[PDB]
Amino acid sequence: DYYDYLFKIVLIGDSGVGKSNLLSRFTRDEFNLGVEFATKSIQLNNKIIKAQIWDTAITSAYYRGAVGALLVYDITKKNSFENIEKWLKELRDNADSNIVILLVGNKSDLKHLRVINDNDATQYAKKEKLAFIETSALEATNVELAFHQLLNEIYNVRQ
Ligand SMILES: Nc1nc2c(ncn2[C@@H]2O[C@H](COP(=O)(O)OP(=O)(O)O)[C@@H](O)[C@H]2O)c(=O)[nH]1
């Protein structure tokens, strides 16, 4: 270590969408076919940020101190996208008002099984005033893009 800043980030969404593998891809560049956390440091002006990222298999305790979150669904499972409103609600009830939130559609490699079209997801994100990006934890597609967008925006909000 040295790190100038510790940013707590929470992953939230239905079981089976890819949260634990988003965590393992970003922090240790690995994929696998109660509550846990992992860390990874990035550098900007030479300023070093330690991302402390969480997921679950304590709601007040889980959200406390979080400065960012990824809201995650599965682009192949309609129910996971419908359930995003509920997870956003739980987040709003329990998180700091200045928390930075990003919508993520995972499993983008399952091209032929898509049920959620990207314009419909973008429409929802804009309504909730969030950025939206599609990822593949399996193929690594856009994983660094999603986490770095989140971390740089938290730094800007903080500064
Ligand atoms: N094809 C594909 N499968 C994935 C992807 N991400 C996760 N999975 C698989 O989907 C299942 C659930 O993922 P997991 O990380 O355990 O979901 P969680 O319950 O949200 O933590 C596992 O069998 C993963 O290997 C992905 O991007 N593409």
Give me the domains of the chain, ranges plus CATH numbers.
1-159 (3.40.50.300)
Q: Ligand 1 centroid vs 16 CA: distance in angstroms?
A: 6
* Structure-solving method: X-ray
* DSSP symbols for the chain: ---SEEEEEEEE--TTSSHHHHHHHHHHS-----EEEEEEEEE----EEEEEEEEE--HHHHHTT--EEEEEEETT-HHHHHTHHHHHHHHHHHS-TT-EEEEEEE-TT-GGG--S-HHHHHHHHHHTT-EEEE--TTT-TTHHHHHHHHHHHHHHHH-
Are 68 and 154 contacting, i.e. CB atoms less than 8 angstroms apart?
Answer: yes
Sheet holding 131-134, edge to edge: 35-43, 48-56, 5-12, 68-74, 100-106, 131-134
Q: Which residues are annotated as a binding site?
A: 16-21, 32-33, 106-107, 109, 137-138
Task: Pick the atom of ligand 1 nearest to 108's CA.
Answer: 27
Q: Is the CB of 19 under 6 A from ligand 1?
A: yes
Resolution (Å) of this entry = 1.8
